């Protein structure tokens, strides 16, 4: 994130970390939309241009995290995926249309002060909140600046 | 452990929704209704954008009606990070919601 600030702990209880078993590394962000379903971008798993096609046994999902680096004992819940669903009309070639995928967890996670699901919009909320000018909020452990660096 | 560029702890940034025409005019790519763009305009002085590694993450909005947080988008793409005249793109969750329903509600919804 560029021009952001350190988040208060527990600020985004729905924040999920998509991580790779081997080699170990941060792959992407995601959101817990319930105790068993995680939402993320289809390109985080499938992007042929970069020779990327992760299946279920390559990824772990780390929920309840604050720090990008360390293993957070008390709060963090690491989990494995049962299923993976990439939108059938996902278009990586032309425009990255339908860039959406759902991760089904092995078994339901246990909510806490640090692990709570976000709501999905509904017609009325979409219509009321989605207006140019209105602000939303983005969170992540992504880079702080454009890269010419690591 | 940590450096500079890759942050140590989770980061946040509140961004304004940009109107569709402006988003379209901002890129040569064939934007779609399934995506929206957000970020400050060059005439705004305020900076801020999602960047590499933030992909898949949520773009949420807190409702002023009920006080719940809704996920409006997913960090999809952009052309670099925080360039003036450029806007970050995000998948349109409400528009793809019917598909989300179908798969969660066992291939039917």
């Amino acid at each position: 994130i560029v021009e952001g600030q350190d988040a208060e702990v527990g600020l985004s209880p729905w924040q999920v970390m998509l991580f790779r078993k081997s080699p170990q590394e941060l792959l992407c962000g995601a959101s817990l939309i319930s105790d068993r379903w995680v939402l993320t971008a289809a390109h985080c798993l499938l992007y042929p241009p970069w020779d990327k096609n992760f299946t279920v046994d390559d990824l772990l999902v780390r929920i309840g995290k604050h720090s990008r680096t360390r293993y957070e004992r008390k709060v963090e819940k690491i989990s494995m995926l049962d299923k993976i669903y990439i939108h059938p009309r996902y278009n990586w070639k032309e425009n990255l249309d339908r860039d959406i995928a759902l991760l089904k967890l092995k078994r339901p996670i246990e909510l806490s002060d640090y692990i709570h699901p976000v709501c999905l919009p509904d017609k009325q909320t979409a219509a009321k909140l989605l207006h140019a000018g209105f602000k939303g909020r983005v969170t992540g452990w992504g880079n702080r600046r454009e890269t010419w660096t690591t | 452990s940590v450096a500079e560029v890759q942050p140590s702890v989770l980061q946040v940034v509140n961004l304004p929704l940009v109107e569709r025409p402006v988003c379209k005019a901002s890129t040569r790519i064939r934007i779609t209704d399934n995506m929206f763009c957000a970020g400050y305009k060059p005439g705004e002085g305020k900076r801020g954008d999602a960047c590499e590694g933030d992909s898949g993450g949520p773009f949420v909005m807190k409702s002023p009606y009920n006080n719940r947080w809704y996920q409006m988008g997913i960090v999809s793409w952009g052309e670099g990070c925080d360039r003036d005249g450029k806007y970050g793109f995000y998948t349109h969750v409400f528009r793809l919601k019917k598909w989300i329903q179908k798969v969660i509600d066992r291939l039917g919804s």
Partner: peptide
């Protein structure tokens, strides 16, 4: 071609 127009999927 997304890549051709400079489009950039979000770690490198």
């Amino acid at each position: 071609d997304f890549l051709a127009e400079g489009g950039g999927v979000x770690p490198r």
